[PDB]
């Protein structure tokens, strides 16, 4: 889903970089430990 990365995640980008990612990855890796935030504004 459309989201904004929080910290450095390797193979994705640097902090502040917006990335499109599959649902399973985002819901099971990024969101639970705050490596990515959904895009609001």
């Amino acid at each position: 889903m459309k989201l904004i990365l929080t910290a450095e995640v390797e193979h994705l980008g640097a902090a502040g970089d917006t990335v499109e990612v599959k649902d399973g990855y985002g819901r099971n890796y990024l969101l639970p430990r705050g490596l990515a935030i959904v895009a609001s504004r």
Partner: protein
């Protein structure tokens, strides 16, 4: 396995039509998946039965 713990989605009832049009009763169960969710950011994990539609809706919090 047929009643969602979030929205209460239940199985549907119908018939299984054959080539000779023999109608026999059958059931349409929901796609219930057992998911360990995180009710509050405190970290407690509980095993709940949520349909895949609920998972798609983000109503379950598997944090």
């Amino acid at each position: 396995a047929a009643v969602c713990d979030i929205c209460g989605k239940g199985p549907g009832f119908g018939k299984s039509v054959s080539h000779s049009h023999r109608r026999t009763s059958r059931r349409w169960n929901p796609n219930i998946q057992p998911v360990r969710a995180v009710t509050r950011p405190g970290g407690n994990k509980q095993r709940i039965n949520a349909c895949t539609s609920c998972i798609k809706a983000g109503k379950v919090s598997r944090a």
